[model samples]
Target: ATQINEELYRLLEDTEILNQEITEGLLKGFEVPDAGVAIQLSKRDVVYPARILIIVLSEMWRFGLTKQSESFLAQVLTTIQKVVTQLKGNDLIPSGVFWLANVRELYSFVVFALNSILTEETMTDEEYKEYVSLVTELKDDFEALSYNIYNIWLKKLQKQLQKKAINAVVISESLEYTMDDILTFFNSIYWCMKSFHIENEVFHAVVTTLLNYVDAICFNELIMKRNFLSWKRGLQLNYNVTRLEEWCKTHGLTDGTECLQHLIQTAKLLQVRKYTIEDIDILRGICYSLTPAQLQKLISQYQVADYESPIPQEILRYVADIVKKEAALSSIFITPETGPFTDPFSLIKTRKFDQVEAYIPAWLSLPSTKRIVDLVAQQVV
Candidate 1:
């Protein structure tokens, strides 16, 4: 690693000089192309050296003291970052590869700059996806990168999604960001799935960053109320899950797709507002989606394996009242009416199935008090 050390030091010194020169020159009314000239004058036919020059010049254009300089800087870092990423197998020296050190610093620096940009401006979902891709390249200290994204980016996103402030829109960055943008983040899950390109059912932080938002959809009330369910404000969650399922299937991401299918079933129960085979799975899955009160409401209605008693009548009735709007909640307390010659609850006035396959199959599926003889009624021939 001796030769690697010397080459790295040279690159570092060159970068410091380039940063100083570019900042000074931009202050002196120098255009960026001229900085490119200084860069060409100092290269070793390797891609990494120019990477530093571009970063320095880009930052000046981005965070410069003046408006004109900042305007010139827009999106330029992405151009350089993309090109730098293409040097996959290239060696910086006899022992060190160019990618290892450069990727970490480049992404760390780029995202640091982006955090500043978001303070001043709004980033598109595509931009966030790109940022996520950049951060994912930092494989060393992988957990730290995820924690930073979680602690800084994802948590900050919650307030935005909740407030949904009018001022947070794109005027002057409006210096505003809200959870509506988070819906856009939700819509972009497939983009993350593609960008991270996780494989072989691996459990990576790349998956965690995205799933954290999914988990939020279940807990954060505003997000859950407004975005998790169908509403006038428009968050099409089940539809998005369906889209994600298709995307995952096409990409061969079976694990994520299966997880999404589970979400779809859960959402369906919420949509229909009653117990279902899906809801039963939620109970069996350890009952996470509901609160203690919600759980108590649900639990009191059924005979769980260990619990000997159903919730008291008046209490179950009160539980029913509290969760009436939630839909999938009420009926577990209301026992089904079953018996031979008894019309199911829907057609209770009549003693037999109405000869329709949909009703007959469902009716017969329930426990019967008597054996029913099958009667075939033929259509007029």
Candidate 2:
């Protein structure tokens, strides 16, 4: 990702083909094809979803988007971020990255293109076919970039191994900060991917899988138990998460910056140790790890004073109040159900949870699910 800079930057500009013809026909339901715009999108350094979310949040603060907008945006973001986190850890930049890149590109392209199509009358043509052709080509190109990624990652890992074989153990950068490099690289390849017009579905599948893992990484509470395929086999990676983690260790980059930055890196990769998603659901242990009251006051205490959005102080207090309320609930593991997550709670309710001891680690060790779990066991549930 860092390989792309001003030195590697290349630019090609040409007048869009079929401009007037497409524009003229646009009024009756036709869209012009623009290979130029697609090409540029593949190479341009663009912002990511999380960055965009921050911007959107800022925009909301500035000009208050409607409630409908907020709800829609928030839900979409939650799901999208999940996918991003998952793919990111595995070192696979999902198609959503492309989707986001395309969004920025199309918007920019439309800025100029729209003006041409906006003469005197409203244009209502379906541009779906044009998009399909362009995007399909882009996806094919994107598929090729995976090889580039593999090669790049291989070299990076080899460098780390080279350092380790010599035992030049230095306090390297944390994984969190290294992630930025990955993000940057993704954009570079994003251009390459878009350049080829690859299929979106593959991108969608890969990116979404990666994003879900991202959500899992953030869950703080999800303790990867000992018996699972991933845990027992060590590198039994259902996702590329562990592979990417080791890559960080081998690379010379410390994750985030400052002490706070380092902590964030540690937090994201803090071992799931020995717990299932159900344990997380029923116990709600993450709350205890950083209760709301502690979170708000802790932020400033830790000098994270740049709180962009003011969380309700009452809610903060409430979270601290119910820190240890662990309600008995099951978790989900069904495949083909990650997207939309139609009924997470329903799945939880159907699982067994009669008796659970802190000493026991796997689901086979637990008993019943009849109580509610909170952040702190002593807090007001």
Candidate 3:
């Protein structure tokens, strides 16, 4: 019994050593896949080793090494905190995504292990309560850490978008060039998430939130900078918005494309003839997301071409009348607001591990983890 306990303790120590190596960048560089290339499911060096630790800790608990198992679990959490602090200082997206994926996997495995243990008829009710409380605390901490890491990653993306792509839709002279730059930016992010095996839900949340931010910024800029209002400019805006919508479709970002509707409707408003009542009626139906106030402002500011007349005074009065009616009706005006980002990790459902198939892929050749994998195979058989 002592021999088995010692072996488990040694495996736990090996995980600690591996964590140190990961923290120091000894295992490998935090490299991301290049843009335009197909991405395969990949993980960082920490994943397999962490997996080993999870299995070993589960064994320790089964072997009645409760104190040791709890101690090791606490250490694992502390190491996560330490690594996250280091990651914050460096703040690279690839590293952040890798760690987030790994942590999520670890959390899921831990939950699975705990659930399996709870189902054992051998444990006393008293022991069950103790284990449940301890595990609940651990789960909360992991969830917090996961959310913290997610926010950090998303904040970095938001900052980059602000710096590089925020005003791109409105400021660029050519729609094609602006679209190329924006698509390139999105493609790099997609490759990073895909190569790192980020779950679909997390990917969806990030993509959707970023697009919302883009919608807000570009729409606001178009409104504030009145000089950009014209039928010609509207054509450019429509082109850019359609390209972005296509990008979302190509990548299967179905949910978030709705955020682009405000800009889409705005662009259409610029292009359509504003003289006819039928035109106004169609605009009203299509631009439901835009407030009456916004419609009135745009109609009043429409820039006329050399061959074409301006938006008729009747049209402006009609929009003004709608605005007055809405005010009198106390109708809720929907503004484009990209609120706080969601935690991608929270969006993930816990996976059940009824039969875990353990094998080292060719890419993972870490000796310590391989040994643990062999040990798990022996135990399972």
Candidate 4:
């Protein structure tokens, strides 16, 4: 038993040395050569190393080498944190998406391994408790790390949106230029995220969060710059909204598109007539997402074209009356929430080891882990 333990310790040290190579490879980011074809393959380099490490550690624990496994697990976790910090320090948007997807994938594998090992009925209660607690900490850390990357990526997007897209949507003279720029921005982000193999839930969360920001910014701009509220401007705004909705639908983003509701209603409110009580009722019915305060503010600030008549004093009075009555209702405009974005991986399903395919791409040149892969292959054989 003593000799076996010594061998296990040697194995642990050897694995740590190899894992250092994997960590360095991870720190040196994977570059997708053929953006069109190799994009999907980029994550393998990061994921396979992490997966193989977990498998090795789990196997060590299975061999009654719990102490060695625990020590190695700490090293593996520290490597992950180092990679995370390196990626964040680089502060590239694609790196954010890249690390977020891979981290979540690793988290899933960790959970799967924990579940599989705990059910084997081999370890004592004390052993089980220690292992579970350590692994749980790892899981929590990964979850937090993912959200940290997500928020950093989101803030970057928000800055770009504010600087270019949001104001352009309302202020650009040619609607085509604005819409084209906006759609292109969306397309590039969608493709980049898809290339990284981001989960659908995370995609939805990102899109929804961005749309909420866009909706808030555009709506606030409209409210502040009342001169831009003409019926013709409404027509243009509606066209932009329709195009955005179409883009979302084309991308299969059915749920997150709901975040566009307030903006959609605002566009409709701008276009619709505000001359009669019947028109007010129509406004009240269709602008369900807009609060009475918003509706009143919009109506009061409405601009008339050369041929169009001004909204009557009585109509404005009626709107004010309605707004007064519905004063208790909350604002529909989405305020930017403070702190980190919510974890999109919270409800991710666990994956089985057998279900995980092992494919080390030709481009992945991490030689140390390649040796472990050979061992894994021979073990399977």
TM per candidate? 0.32, 0.21, 0.79, 0.81
User: Best-fitting candidate, measured by TM-score?
Assistant: 4
In model 4, which regions exceed 4 Å deviation?
1-11, 14-20, 32-46, 59-93, 123-125, 175-177, 328-333, 337-340, 355-368
User: Lowest summed-lDDT stretch of 10 residues in model 2?
Assistant: 366-375
State the TM-score for model 2: 0.21
Report residue 25 deviation for candidate 3 (angstroms): 6.5
How many clashes (backbone atoms < 3 Å, residues ≥3 apart in a chain or on different chains) does model 2 have? 59
lDDT of 3: 0.68
**Considering TM-score, where higher is better, how would the candidates rank from best to worst?**
4, 3, 1, 2
In model 4, the Cα lDDT at residue 182 comes to 77
Q: How does each model score on lDDT?
A: 0.33, 0.29, 0.68, 0.68
lDDT by residue for model 1 over 264-301, one digit each (tens)?
A: 43344344322343444454354444443444433343
Against the true structure, candidate 3 reaches a TM-score of 0.79
Kindly list the per-residue Cα lDDT of model 3 for residues 1-381, writing each as its tens digit.
466456655765554554543433322433423323454444433355445556665666666666656666666666655655565322355666767776787788777766766686556788788888877777787777777767766776776676656456877756323667788778877876777667787778888888887887777777766655888989988777777898888887886559787788889888878897788888988887888888887788778878887777787778889889988998223343334556767766875455545655454445554555566676654
The C-alpha stretches of model 3 lying farther than 4 A from their native spots are 1-7, 10-46, 59-91, 175-177, 276-278, 331-339, 344-348, 354-381
Which window of ten consecutive residues has the lowest lDDT sum in model 3? 26-35
Model 1, residue 155: C-alpha shift (Å): 5.2
Candidate 1: where are CA atoms >4 Å away? Answer: 1-19, 22-102, 105-204, 222-237, 255-266, 271-292, 296-381
Candidate 4 similarity to native, TM-score? 0.81
Count of clashes, each model: 7, 59, 0, 0
Model 1, position 140, has a per-residue lDDT of 29
